């Protein structure tokens, strides 16, 4: 039972700049992770998993990072529709199993 803690809870940054979101684990999660963005109104959407691979199609403006017990997701230039909630899901023991976070609310102005 690895407990993950995200931070901050909420974040309001001016348009056009970068955004940095941290999610912190309590044990070794090496590079086994994922990030889901559940825009309000439909199912979540995975953006960047493991250590730093930028998802296909996905504008380079997104960036995932971290390894070991600490990870971070970073967005280069937030567009107006990027406002949503994000969760980092780890699976270092996959054979059915997954463990979610408390979520983080990201907005604009």
């Amino acid at each position: 039972e690895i407990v993950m803690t995200q931070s901050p809870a909420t974040l309001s940054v001016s348009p056009g700049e970068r955004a940095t979101l941290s999610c912190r684990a309590s044990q070794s999660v090496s590079s086994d992770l994922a990030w889901y963005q559940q825009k309000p109104g439909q199912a979540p959407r995975l953006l960047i998993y493991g250590a730093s691979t930028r998802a296909t199609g996905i504008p380079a403006r997104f960036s995932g990072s971290g390894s070991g017990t600490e990870f971070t997701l970073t967005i280069s230039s937030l567009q107006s529709e990027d406002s949503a909630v994000y969760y980092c899901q780890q699976y270092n023991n996959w054979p059915p199993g997954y463990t979610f976070g408390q979520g983080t609310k990201l907005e604009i102005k």
Partner: protein, 148 residues
Amino acid sequence: DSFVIRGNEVSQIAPGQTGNIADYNYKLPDDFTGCVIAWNSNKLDSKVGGNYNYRYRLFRKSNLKPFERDISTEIYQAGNKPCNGVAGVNCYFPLQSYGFRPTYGVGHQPYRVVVLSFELLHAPATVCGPKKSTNLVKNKCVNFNFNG
């Protein structure tokens, strides 16, 4: 044929090149004779609010035939119904915005592109440009070419 694409996808406009923009949006033939030209419109089409008026094609049912206009308003889906009666699953929409705004780097600056395709079948060619108006030499034994 003028259009607007994302800067990092200009390399896909080429004879038989394979990708997304050249497979589902706009596809030039393999033996296409003619030329394309592209300008880094990092000023001409951009707004701090997002110059995403244009929605490129990211959902297509089948590969493109050369010069196949595929303007459509549909819902790409997986199962029986589209999202009008379903939600989450099988509610996909091919028109994705660009989000052109000035903070974007070069690779994502809206390039305006113009492609010229010269057809030569049965050609009573009506468009050339060789009118050479040389300064008419006088009083000397000279070779002249007056309208042929």
